[PDB]
Structures are given as structure tokens and as C-alpha cells.
Write a protein that binds this DNA or RNA. Structure first.
Ligand SMILES: [Mg+2]
Ligand SMILES: [Mg+2]
Lengths: 148, 118
RNA sequence: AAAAAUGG
RNA sequence: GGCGACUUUCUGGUCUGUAACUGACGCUGAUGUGCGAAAGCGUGGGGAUCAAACAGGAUUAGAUACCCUGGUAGUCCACGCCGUAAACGAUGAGUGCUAAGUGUUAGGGGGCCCCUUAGUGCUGCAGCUAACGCAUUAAGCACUCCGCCUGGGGAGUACGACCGCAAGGUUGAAACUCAAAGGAAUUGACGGGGACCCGCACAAGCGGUGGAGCAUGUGGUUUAAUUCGAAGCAACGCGA
RNA sequence: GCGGGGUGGAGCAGCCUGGUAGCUCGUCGGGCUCAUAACCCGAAGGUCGUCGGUUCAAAUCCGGCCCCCGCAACCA
RNA sequence: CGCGGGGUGGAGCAGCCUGGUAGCUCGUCGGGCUCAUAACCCGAAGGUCGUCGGUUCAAAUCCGGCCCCCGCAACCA
């Protein structure tokens, strides 16, 4: 019961970094429309990761998203079995940012800027909660690899 | 404690419940065998072509370790994994001299079991 | 191609 | 009823063409007398497979089933018995007459074609039929003989008789009870039928309710009264 | 006469070895359903047959009263 | 009495042979799954290996003492 696919929205680049991914991360972090709170939180987290890593904030964030972006997922089809299926590039970015923020919000730090900075650092090191989520997704996709 | 042969026969039996592969000499002596059940697959997965491909690859690796180079394919059963087994045998490096399906076509002899009502 | 009864 | 590897022996029936031969010797067929799928029974043999019963394993609320693993009788053979099937084309046999088109099997006659006999299919007039349909293989038009029916249930039961080793078979009521049972076709509705489509229906997401304090409506209970109405979705911040 | 037993509504553990009452079904409340059943979540329910004793403490160990079960009740 | 074997998450089995590492099947918790339910897939927690000693850089593993269970065998105060 659906005529087709709808056009997708296009966000503007980050004002300072000029990165659509940064803009989309700001949108993910934003709650109740508090765009300013989202922006300040993200910039503080970027500054903290820059300070703690001595490497470009954009470079480390790109590494983190590359680490926490999945390639395969398990989508049920039917007599009914979950089948591994490649993930679209936009689903990759969506899932990477979504998992990043979701598992940042669960960290034990006091402030969201600290939580996000630590999470992006751990993801860049390939040892974060979002990384664990991606690993579980990939292994279960492999487990169901036969049904592909 | 080593067997060295150049030509041989790979027997692949593919039934809707499992796939079995073995390699023997031209006079039918077994060296190693591989089945989806041994590989690990259970239930539905044992019928999938992937399990057949894995079993054929394992069996072919053992056969070439013993030193097999050329092999003739002997196919039995209507299962779906026969083609995957053939392709795995080819890709393992063994040379497929010829393929033949030796599934036993019964003449009018014995009465088959009852048709299932499920 | 799992199982899913009944209703003055 | 049934009959499917091949070979040999014995043996039944059917069709085609001549018109030597008999010259109505025919049709039907109560009672009789025989054959008759499968299961089953008796004696003896055989026994792979399959598989009632049975035993486990599953499923399930239960599962004395469906599914899985086994498995005895039986399935096979000889000789007896049984004599029943949706033993069906749900259509007795014989005979003649009544448009056509087209396939196929076994023949025959005339020039790849035409005609013809006997079957076996499909389509289709007249006619028939409640309709569905039948339609030279009639369910049409006619004549002969036979069998059979007379609302549903009780009941193919009871009694009696005959038959059978048995299982049972054949024949076969009544009391009583109902105003219905039925056939075909039609329009809906429905289906753990099909096809094609829609909807925040699902999927992909985001945010809630259900836990706490409070506001409010409702139920219940209390009260002299706790005014009446609203009750699944489509009553309960609803009349207000 | 001798043994064994009596524990939420039912059936059955726990006793041997004192400090701890368990399981299945049933009941009640909420949920699911158009409704019932099934099902899911949560809860209540036994002074351990009844009297005495030992013990700091008794379902538990010991002795009576009651009830049930089983076995025995033989020789003339 | 002699000879063997066994004791490992809540249950049932490996790993001991030959020193490192605690694995496998059920069970509980969370997630995917579905109209639920089951089945199935993925994440966790779960014994420090019967107990006390001994040799080693290192012990479930090797060597002793001890506590139980099983098999066979022995037993003329
Ligand atoms: Mg009704
Ligand atoms: Mg109910």
C-alpha cells in the first residue's frame, strides 16, 4: 500500500567544519528542537577529543564513524527467516550516528560533551559500545550468511 | 602413512536434508569425507547451497593435501547443493574431468512410502 | 511446509 | 471385475471384405447358474519393500491423530471360502430413424485427396431437460422385454428364512416421530482460496501511556441525597 | 497385634540430619478476546491431625488421643 | 584389605593423556523474531575444577595426605 519512494532531505554543511555528517550528528543529538544546545554540546565534544588525542577532530570522528558503520544487516523475509542483506550508504551513516549517540548517552561520564567525546574516542580506537553493536550485527549476519 | 594419487573420483550425495562429499581412488577407497552435519550446519541450513559448497571445499582441500589433481564428479540425489559442490570442487584447484549423475532411477520394483499429509 | 478450540 | 518386461505352449472374443451355404434358427429374461476390486477368513509355503494393530519420539490445553523412528498381520504364491465397493458414464438390453465440424485406433474401396465399416474423443443443430446439460457413443424420435421408485427419519434396523468357518451377505417391516427432507440454479456473505490495489495497516523511525504526586471523568461503595443521561471500536477532560 | 501415614482448596515434597514450609493444579487481580477457553504478568492462601514433653528454638526429636492405609489374626 | 575409575557454573558432559588458556548441551537474564506462542539467531551473568599440602616462571592438568561414590577381587580371633 505505497505508491513509491519519497525525496530525501539534504542538510547544510557544518558552519565551521563544513561536514554534512557533522550537521546530521547535530540533528541526532538535538532534543525538543534545542539546536543551540546540540551545537554547543557537539563542539565542546570535538574540542575535548582534539585536546585528548592531538589529532584533527574531523579525522578522528571520520575514523570513528567508519569503525561503527555496518555493512550487513539481518532483515526478515518469507517459511520466515532472517536473511543477511547489504546496507545502503545512507543507512550506514544513519546507523553510525544513531548508535554513536545512543551509546554515548549511556556512558558514565557526567556531561553529554564528555560522554560524546569519550564515545567517539573509543569508536576511533575500535573498542566502543557502538563498535560492539556493529560487531554483533556483523556476526549474526555471518551466522545467517547461508540464507543469503 | 601418506597416499599419493593423481586421478580420483569425488562422490557428492545431495539430499533435501544434508549434503555429503567424499574423494576416493578410481577403485573406490575413501581418503576423507565432509558433510554439512560435520561442518556444523543444523536443520534448514544443511540443505542450503552454501553448506554444500563448504563441504566440497573441505573435502577437496583434504584430497589435494593427499595429492589429488584430476577428479571425476559422481552426483547422487536431487538436492539443491550439487551445483555449488561442483563449483567449489572447480575453485579448489582440482580439475573436473567429467560430471555424471548416478542417481539410482528405480524401475517399477519397490513400493515407495506413504505420501505425507503435512 | 509448526499449533491456534468454542459461541441457545 | 480388470489386463502393461520378454520367450514358448494351450485357449476365448471382436472388427473388415466377398455373398458359397442354413433360411427367422431372433430380442429380452423372473426363477436358476457362474464370474466378480480391495479388505477379510482356512490350510500350507514365502517374506524384500510397504504397512492396519502396536511401541517409542514430537505437536497440542489434551492428541488414543495428522508429522518422525521402528513394526506384526497383511501385501506375494497354491488351493478353498467370502460375494461386497462412489463394482460409476451415479445412464439395463435389443432394434430402427433424426444437421454438421474435427482428432485418433483397426481395416476396406476409388483417384496427397475422396468415399466407407467398426470403435474411441472433442465441438455443435433440431429435439429433450427443473436447470445443469445430453445431442448418430442421446439424456432426441419410436417399439419389445427386464430390473427398480413412490416424503424425511426410524432403517438397510428388528423378527423370520436362506447362505457363510467367521466377519458378515441376501431378503426385509412396523410402532413412533417431523412438515419438511431433496435437485439445479441465483444474489449476497464468508474462507486458516486466488489476483490486483489502498490506509501510520506493516516495515524504517521519533515520542508517549501502563510505575510516582496532583487535576479530571467513570465504575464501585458510603450517604438523607451523593440529580439524570452516555457503555467495545463509535461511553469514561463525554451533555458540562 | 505390628508397622506406615495425617503439611494452603486437591495431589505430592520437605522429617532421616531442629534454626530454611517447596512443586503441579486450583483460587483472586490485571492483561489478550466481540465473549469464553487457552495463554501472559502479579498476588493471597497451611498456627504442619490434636494434646503433653525435651530444647534457647519443634513439620522435624519423644510420649498419649483421634483418623486413614497395609500386613497379621494360626493348631485343634 | 588390593586394584582401577569418578568428584568441574543451577543440572548433564569435555579439557587431565602431553603444564599454561577453564570449553560443549541444557537452565536463567536481555535483544532480534512473530497477530501473538513455539522454534530459531545474537549478547550476558553464571564453577576457579571434592578438600589440605608438595615440585615448578606457570597446576583442573604433575606428586602426596585426606572425604565420599562405583566395578571386580580378597577376608578361619
Ligand atoms: Mg450459533
Ligand atoms: Mg477470558
Amino acid at each position: 500500500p505505497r505508491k513509491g519512494s519519497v525525496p530525501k532531505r539534504d542538510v547544510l554543511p557544518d558552519p565551521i567544519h563544513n561536514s554534512k555528517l557533522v550537521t546530521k550528528l547535530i540533528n541526532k543529538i538535538m532534543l525538543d528542537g534545542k539546536r543551540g544546545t546540540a551545537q554547543r554540546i557537539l563542539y565542546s565534544a570535538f574540542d575535548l577529543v582534539e585536546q585528548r588525542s592531538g589529532r584533527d577532530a574531523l579525522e578522528v570522528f571520520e575514523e570513528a564513524i567508519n569503525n561503527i558503520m555496518p555493512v550487513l544487516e539481518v532483515k526478515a523475509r518469507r517459511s520466515n527467516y532472517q536473511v543477511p542483506v547489504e546496507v545502503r550508504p545512507e543507512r550506514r551513516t544513519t546507523l553510525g550516528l544513531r548508535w554513536l549517540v545512543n551509546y554515548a548517552r549511556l556512558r558514565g561520564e557526567k556531561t553529554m560533551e564528555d560522554r560524546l567525546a569519550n564515545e567517539i574516542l573509543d569508536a576511533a580506537n575500535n573498542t566502543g559500545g557502538a563498535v560492539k553493536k556493529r560487531e554483533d550485527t556483523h556476526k549474526m549476519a555471518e551466522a545467517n550468511k547461508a540464507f543469503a | 602413512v601418506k597416499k599419493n594419487i593423481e586421478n580420483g573420483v569425488a562422490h557428492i550425495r545431495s539430499t533435501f536434508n544434508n549434503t555429503i562429499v567424499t574423494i576416493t581412488d578410481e577403485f573406490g577407497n575413501a581418503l576423507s569425507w565432509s558433510s554439512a552435519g560435520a561442518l556444523g550446519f543444523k536443520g534448514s541450513k544443511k540443505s542450503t547451497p552454501f553448506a554444500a559448497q563448504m563441504a566440497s571445499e573441505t573435502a577437496s582441500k583434504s584430497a589435494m593435501e593427499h595429492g589429488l589433481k584430476t577428479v571425476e564428479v559422481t552426483v547422487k540425489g536431487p538436492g539443491p547443493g550439487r551445483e555449488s559442490a561442483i563449483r567449489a570442487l572447480q575453485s579448489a584447484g582440482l580439475e573436473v574431468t567429467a560430471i555424471r549423475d548416478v542417481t539410482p532411477v528405480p524401475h517399477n520394483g519397490c513400493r515407495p512410502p506413504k505420501r505425507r499429509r503435512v
